[PDB]
Every structure is written in C-alpha cells, then in structure tokens.
C-alpha cells in the first residue's frame, strides 16, 4: 500500500508565451542584456516558478544519501462577509415572523347635527401585515484521518496546525456562502421588481454622466429624508420616512475608483459632491442594469436560528467527521424604502480628452497635442482637429501639431471631434483646449 | 493602453490599478488573481507595486 | 512690447524685470548696467522699481 | 526641444530632469551617465543643477 508517481515533467500544465532562456542566450543589446552575466540563470529559470510534484534527489557528494525537506509552512487565511453588519438578532427555535404596520387615516368635516346619530359608527384602523418564513437549512461536512495523516508530518506543532486549518476552512466556506446568500437577496428583489426604479446614464461612460448620477443620488436621499414622509419609495405604498444615518448605498469598486479619480480629486469641497449615505463596496451585482442600490438598514430581515457544530468518530476506519449545521431565515421588509438606480444602453463613444486644457505658446512656437477617446468597443475611431479662434497663418495638422501665425493677439480654441453617427445624421463629441499667445 | 502616451491613458491606468487593488483587498476573497485558483485574500498593507 | 496691451505682454514684462533684477544682484558683478562701464554690484534690498 | 518655446515644452523639460535625477539616484547603480563606463551611484543631496 504505497502511491508512487513516475516520469513527471516539471512543466506540467504551463504554457509559455516565449522561452526566457532562449531569449537570454540569443540576445544582442536588447532588454535581456542584464541577465547575461548571471551564471546559474538556467536553474533559476526552470525552478523559480515552483514545482507541483516532489521527487527524491540524491546529493552530489555521496550518491547513496537522499536530500531532505528543510522547511514546511502551513498557509492560513481568514474570510468574512462585509454584509454581516446587516444581520438582525437571533431567534432560538421560532419561525413564521409576523410584521405588522398601521397606516394613517382620513380627516373628517366637523358636524353636530349628524354627531348625535353617528356616535357609534366604526372606522377600521387600516392595518396591514406580512410574513417571513425560514428558508435556509444546510450543513458542512469534513473528515479527518489523523492516524493515517501522522506519517506525513514530523512535528506535532505542524500536525496540529494542519488539523486546525480544516476547521478554519469550514468556517471560511460558511462565511462565503452567507455572503453569497445575502447578495442574492437583492438580485431576487430586483427580479421580482419591487424596487423603486430611477433611470440614469452609465456612470462609467463619461464625467457628465457620473456627476448627473451623483446629483440624482443626493436628491433621492434628500427627498427620502423628509419628516412628512411619502409613499413613492417602498413596495406596498405606505406613508413612512427614513433617517440619513440609516441610508446605505451599495456600489462597485470600479465606480468608487472612477469617482475618486474624476470628481473628488478635482473637486474643492468634497462634501458638496460626495455620496451622502453610508457607502458599501461589493464585487458588483448580477442584474443586467443595476448600478448602485440605496436602501434602509431595516430593509434586511436576516435572522439565524441554528449554528451548531457536532463531531462523530468512526473507530473501524479510525477517523473523525465534523458537521457544521446552519439554519437561517433570509428575507426582506417591504415597508422600508429601496431605490435601484438602473441604467440603460451605453453609447459606443462617450467623451474625448486631448491634453492639459490650459496651454501658453509664443508667436513662433509649435505645440503637440495628444488624444484619448473613451470608447466602450475595441474598434478605434479616427479624430479630426480644427481651430476656431485664430487669425490667418496659424493652423493645426492632422497628427496634432499646432503652429501659430506670424502675428496675432487672441485666444486659440483647438477642437478635436469624433464622428460616430450614420449617414446624414452625424453624432459629434467635442473636446476643447485653451491656448494663449505670449508676444 | 499606455502609462505614458497621454494623460487620459495615464489616468485610466491609475483608475484600473486602484480598482484592481480594491477588489484584491476584499473580505470575502476571490479566486481570479492567483495561479492555484484557491479562495485567497490579501491585505492592503501587504501589497507592493 | 507693452505693459498693458495684453496679459501675455504683461507677464512677459514681469519675467523680463525679474530676470534683470536677478542678473543685477550677481555676486561676481558686471559692468553692463552702469554709465561708467565699471564692474560693480548691487543688492536686492537696495534695488528700487 | 526648447525651454522658452512653450509651457508644454517647459513641463516636458521638467519631467525629463526629474526622471534623470531619479535614475541617477537609483540605489543599484548604473554606468549610463559617466564619461568612462563604471557602475556608480550618486546621492540626491549631492546633485547640483
């Protein structure tokens, strides 16, 4: 009873774009000239990536001896779900949560002639309820054969560390599954279509769309936070209001980075253009148009009913089995506000930026302007340059070289445009730079 | 595109790197950044560019 | 050219005057800025415009 | 190209000078900036422009 492997090459599943040893060997003044004086470069090239299968190697002095393992390291990692803060309390063994809400009533004209007859008339409080049911019951199972595993270790410390790594893996799997469930809740809600939808342009497309989305988000949060409330922001429309400290906005990492590099960096008084609610960054959504979700903390209705760990022992096989049972109720509350911020189709070409906007040139100098078109498609689109404010003798070539006339005193306006429309229907994006003339 | 060809390309590279670092440093982990395709996680203070 | 014809002319005049003051206050001195053509040297605290 | 031609040329010259200074101060040394090729390293506090 022994498992062995024979004739296993070092490059098991590795595909090479180029051969680095060949590049080093055949090179004359290229970028690989620095590795030429290296003596033992081939061994580093062929081993430095690491090997997947071990093989016994005899040492080079006394071939009867076998080289040993010097160091063994156990890698440990901890995972958490950033949405864990949204979980409510813990219910020991209950089920069928009932949520009850009483709405406002109607005002009546004062009267005394009919008030002597309608004393005992009834008017129902107009109350509405909804229910939540337990919907998650699962377990994680893993076995440990310690007696047979002892032969792979020499130190009890390493043995115990490797034993605990499996329990850590169980816990990490539980955490990631909980995160996935709590993220799937939002997508399920959107698929049911109970969000309040707001149509926006693609924030990633251009800078104008991003600032328009910022304006819409700020206005939406403001109109959510009024004392008199509204019925336009929650399913089963009822008069309710939210608080600014309770509003959570879930966005994406790409959106965060683009906002930070485009608006906040260039904006004096960040607080006048930043998001108002508590921001939370995730790894995107699964819906086809969801961009960012603005919800209330009471929107979540996540409870945990059972979190149990049990162990059993098989003596015939000499091993342990570990079971981790998780029972949870995962649902949402329709009495809380929830806005979706969905986007439509994205244009092929969004904006163009040529160069630092402000430039200064003399009356006989030359200037070089670059270009960058934010294109959502792999195809490249040609640009055309022109000048609006200038006298005779000054001109810009097609490659982006601007030359000034012999004598002029005005402001130069260089415009680079891209055409993306069809026939007899142009669609032009405008990028402008200001160039001043110094006599 | 190019870290040097134009300022638009430079700022696009900056945005891309920032987003990549943010998604690398995520509590839930990811499998899209290592050669063994294991669910791993990195810390911001341990990242070198 | 002119101190008040344009912003470019004004800033060119400012640059010229600053350069002139800097080359006037040179430790080694010069003989190009006096009617006696004698190598002298001035000071910033003594220069007046 | 020319320092006094335009602001873009001036800032290009500034960028080139800063990059050259950093390359000179790179710790591992280089033999690309001396009259006879010897691998030498300089310190930023010792650089005079």
Curated annotation (Swiss-Prot), chains B, C, D:
Protein's name in the database: Major capsid protein
Q: Which domain of life is it from?
A: Viruses
Which start and end residues of the full protein are shown?
A: 201 to 249 of 448
Query: What species does this protein belong to?
Result: Bacillus phage phi29 (Bacteriophage phi-29)
Quote the function comment for this protein. Assembles to form a prolate capsid shell of about 54 nm in length and 45 nm in width, with a T=3, Q=5 symmetry.
Q: What is the lineage of its organism?
A: Viruses, Duplodnaviria, Heunggongvirae, Uroviricota, Caudoviricetes
Q: How does this protein assemble?
A: Homohexamer. Homopentamer. The prolate capsid is composed of pentamers and hexamers of the capsid protein.
Q: Which family does the entry's similarity section mention?
A: Belongs to the phi29likevirus major capsid protein family.
Location in or out of the cell: Virion
